[model samples]
Target: GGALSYETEILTVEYGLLPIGKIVEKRIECTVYSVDNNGNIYTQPVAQWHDRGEQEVFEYCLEDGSLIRATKDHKFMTVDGQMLPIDEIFERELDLMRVDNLPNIKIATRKYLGKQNVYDIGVERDHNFALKNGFIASN
Candidate 1:
């Protein structure tokens, strides 16, 4: 008998910086799929996918132009559940998207509250817990 050896794999995506808001408004909705321990792939609407499969909670927020993120005891209870004092949660993996040849766009966004020159917008990279190699590993 011998020890098992393994290699790490990294999945990467090209990303770009996006300002808080753009001249045009865009909306996005998609179904996110997950693979369980048994290699069962389950699907859930992006809206409810976060906690529907995993019980873990993530704290991320975006208000105005500031971004803040931290982990705490959470259950994805409500829209306000991710909010903190103010602007404490600027961005989350679910907030950005990957497009073909285009910059990343912010999802579930709001009306731009400032001049076009004063605001910024583009594409970004997002990695949920799914990217973690041993996220569900057990001893």
Candidate 2:
């Protein structure tokens, strides 16, 4: 018999720092990263309200359906519906891998905020999404 095989894929979701939600005071960019059967990452962007640093904020899910932070270089917290500045999030699992059944998704958002909310600069994607865009893959 051969060894068990696992497929994985990666996804990344990103969003700009917007002043839309009232629960949080500051603007933050958040990402939710997912991996499929082939070990690739697929990410989705969430709300980050306390991160002031320049590092990317993302959550990662492993092949066994286990979820964890991509790295401890960042932090996440929630207080009275407000996320605070905490360093590092670690959640580990030993079995049952979680994967995003829907793969290869591109989402677009449009804002009609006029001069009242047009002072903030547009958010640029810093993380590598493309397969050839500085991507480091492992088998």
Candidate 3:
């Protein structure tokens, strides 16, 4: 028979002042490991180390293979090869997700524009395709 085990280490009690009152909670880091009868060892990243207050930017993947990144800079939205403003990038992604057809995508994207005829950001599908073709294809 195989058994799973977990180990946890308390890091600190994080305290923050809320608008109403002060709040405190314990921060912890953990690891899970399993051992089989054959002595095979398996480890899971269930509670991997993460920064609580680091000024950093990272990419996150969507189920449809799209990537969205968040950063401390409030003005920039980095998706695909384009570094665009948040509003523009958001509108483009929303259109691509909601509109299945290209013409409709064009319409939805243009509906918000007062004078600009085209979007500064690339289509969301195009970006997804590029990622799927490059990293996914190579791997």
Best by TM-score: 1
> Which scores higher on lDDT, 1 or 3?
3
Could you give the C-alpha RMSD of every candidate to the true structure, in order shown? 17.7, 18.0, 18.0
Model 1 agreement with the true structure over 1-139: per-residue lDDT tens digits: 0000111111222222221111112222333333333444443332211111122222232332422222232112112222122122234533222212223223233232321111111122211211112111100
Q: Kindly list the per-residue Cα lDDT of model 3 for residues 1-139, writing each as its tens digit.
A: 0000011111112321111000112223222232223423333322322222322332323434544333323233132223343345445652221112222121121122121111111111121111111210000
Q: Return the TM-score for each candidate structure.
A: 0.20, 0.18, 0.18
Q: Report how far residue 11 has shifted in candidate 3, in Å.
A: 33
Error of 2 at 98 (Å): 21
CA lDDT of every candidate: 0.22, 0.25, 0.23
The alpha-carbon lDDT assigned to residue 53 of candidate 2 equals 22
Q: Model 3, which residues run further than 4 Å from truth?
A: 1-53, 56-60, 66-69, 72-82, 94-139
Cα deviation of 119 in candidate 3 (Å)?
A: 28
Judge candidate 1 at residue 22 and give its lDDT: 19
Question: Could you give candidate 2's per-residue lDDT for residues 80-119 as a string of tens digits?
Answer: 1112222211222112222323222111211222111111
Error of 3 at 10 (Å): 32
